[PDB]
Every structure is written in C-alpha cells, then in structure tokens.
Write a protein that binds this ligand. Structure first.
Ligand SMILES: NC(=O)CC[C@H](NC[C@@]1(O)OC[C@@H](O)[C@@H](O)[C@@H]1O)C(=O)O
Ligand SMILES: [Ca+2]
Ligand SMILES: [Ca+2]
Length: 326
C-alpha cells in the first residue's frame, strides 16, 4: 500500500523491463515498488471507473495513448520528464513516455514449411499456398492492418486504405475468410511464445521479442520483418494514481540512457532513448534483431495512433465478431 505499483504484460518483456529499468532505477532512488500484469489498457479504465485506483505506472502502446487520454484514464506528465530530442519524434506526449520500439510480425513453424514459409501478409492469408493453423492476437492493433496488407495495399498506404468505410469493411471481410484457419486467438506474449515453443501453430502474427525468446528456448520457428508493424511501447501514469508524485520520479529515472542501454541484454527489443545506443555500442549482430534497425524499418510500416484514436471502438466490435464466429 506504500509502494509504487508498476504494471506491464508479463513474461520475458516484463522480466526485461524489471531487470534493466525498474530494479536499477528504484535502487538509485532508494524506493520500493510492486509489480502487476494486465493485457489491455481497458483494465486501467475499469480501476478509474470503479473509483479505486491501485496502479501507478502502466505500460501501454503508442496507439493506446490517444484512446486512454480521451477516456480520462491518464495523468498529465510533469514537463521535462525527458528531453524529447533523445526519443523518436511523436514517441513522447504529455501523457506517455516511450521505452522501446518492437515489431508485430510473421513467424512460421519450420517443421511445417521448412525455409519456404509465409514471407508476407498475402502469404499468411493464403490457406491454399500455405495450409495450416494460424494464430492471431485477440486485440485488433496490427491485425486489421495485416488484412489490409494481405489484400495488396502497399505498406505506405495502409492507413489511407483504412480511412474509408469500404476499406475497413474489406479488411474485416478478409479476416472473416481467414477465421476458420485460426486455431488460437492468443491473449498474451507469453502464451504466443508457448504456442511457438510447443509447435502448436503453423504460423503466427505476434511480437518479435516473444518470437526470438521462443527460438532462443529451442523453438523450430523462423520469422521475417517483411510487412511487420513498427510499434512503440511506453509508460503512462493512471489518473488518480495513489503514489502519483513517487511514480513521476520513478518514470523520470527509468527513462534515462544509463538504464535504457541494458533493455535488450537478453530480450530482443529496441531502446527508445537514442543516447542508449552510444552508451551500449551494440554489435551489428545485435542491431539486426532490432525493430528500429534501418534494414528492418525499410520493410515495415509504423503504427498510426491517429487511425486508432478514431476507429478503435469500431475495430474492437468488428474484430470481436470475427473471433466470436468460432
Ligand atoms: N517493447 C517490446 O519489445 C515488447 C512488445 C510487446 N508489447 C506489447 C504491448 O505493449 O501492447 C499493448 C498492450 O497490449 C500491452 O499489454 C503490451 O505489452 C510485448 O509485450 O512483447
Ligand atoms: Ca515471453
Ligand atoms: Ca516482443
């Protein structure tokens, strides 16, 4: 009840944040903290709506931020919590501080397809060319866009296509056509990593760090950055946080280059603080696994928070219908 409560999505990703950021920053500030886990920012909304907020810091996505901010779920962060020039443009708002870049990408089972696995969203959606069990997230960010890409939309026109009612309906129709081949709608990064380790799916759209972690654990899977979504993860403080002031100081400390440099030590993620790269001096081998590496960025498209700030409610309901058809 006296400790700052920080929450992310568990598994290897939470363990990496706790080791590189939370435990060293709390030690430097001589403070005590408690961890929690959640999969959707709507759980932070529920706390705000119930009138009993227990979480202080929440780890959310860059495209969750406009929605959460509009719903009054987030506190406004103190000015100069970070220097905006040290982070990618748009990754730091008045209610969010980025901690990393990651990819929502295609991974496939080498026992099923060998080296000849799906290398694009058109291939992921091609049950004729690639027969097998698919796994998709139970939340729509990266999933609606995957269907738009599968329909032939160029990566740079994804959100131009999803700007019309016609494009949005076509993306849902493409997901509905794929739905009978979707054996599991994964709910957490650790569950997606477990599906990969057990070879329970033939192909999956999930986060790069989770995929690489499963492969490091022995999974006979391969993956590509082609047609992947370049995402941004970060921190926000819950509106009415019981330890708001202490949380603000903790978030300021953990955003520093000295902690950020250690974030990809074992977990395949890309630090958001640009000064971390100079401090750590990552090997080319290390850089190649990073979502934000130039060669990887070249075959990706960035998530658009402006799209999600407008059509999240529609996407949630329509995507729920696609999954509820099973
Ligand atoms: N930054 C990273 O490298 C990790 C990427 C990825 N994070 C995705 C996430 O932030 O997306 C929005 C929310 O669903 C979160 O629960 C989740 O941790 C993961 O958990 O694997
Ligand atoms: Ca994991
Ligand atoms: Ca990951």
């Amino acid at each position: 009840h006296m400790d700052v409560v920080i929450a992310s999505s568990g598994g290897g990703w939470q363990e990496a944040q706790d080791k590189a950021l939370w435990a060293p920053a709390a030690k430097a500030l001589n403070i005590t903290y408690t961890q929690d886990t959640f999969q959707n920012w709507a759980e932070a909304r529920a706390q705000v709506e119930s009138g009993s907020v227990t979480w202080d810091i929440i780890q959310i996505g860059i495209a969750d931020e406009p929605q959460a901010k509009a719903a009054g779920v987030l506190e406004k962060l103190d000015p100069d919590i970070v220097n905006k020039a040290d982070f990618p443009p748009g990754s730091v708002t008045d209610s969010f501080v980025a901690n990393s870049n990651y990819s929502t990408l295609i991974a496939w089972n080498k026992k099923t397809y060998g080296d000849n696995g799906p290398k694009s969203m058109a291939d992921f959606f091609d049950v004729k060319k690639f027969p097998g069990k698919r796994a998709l997230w139970n939340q729509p960010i990266g999933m609606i866009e995957a269907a738009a890409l599968a329909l032939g939309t160029p990566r740079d026109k994804v959100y131009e296509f999803l700007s019309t009612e016609e494009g949005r309906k076509a993306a849902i129709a493409k997901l509905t056509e794929l739905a009978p081949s979707v054996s599991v709608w994964w709910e957490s990064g650790a569950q997606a990593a477990q599906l990969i380790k057990d070879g329970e799916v033939d192909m999956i759209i999930t986060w790069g760090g989770r995929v690489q972690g499963a492969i490091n654990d022995g999974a006979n899977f391969a993956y590509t950055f082609n047609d992947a979504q370049l995402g941004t993860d970060g921190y926000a403080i819950v509106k009415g946080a019981p330890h708001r002031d202490a949380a603000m100081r903790f978030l300021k400390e953990m955003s520093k280059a000295e902690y950020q440099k250690d974030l990809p030590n074992s977990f395949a993620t890309a630090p958001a603080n640009m000064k971390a790269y100079d401090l750590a001096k990552y090997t080319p081998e290390k850089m190649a696994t990073m979502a934000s590496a130039p060669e990887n960025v070249a075959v990706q498209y960035s998530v658009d928070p402006n799209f999600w700030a407008k059509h999240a409610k529609w996407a949630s309901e329509a995507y729920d219908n696609v999954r509820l058809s099973r």
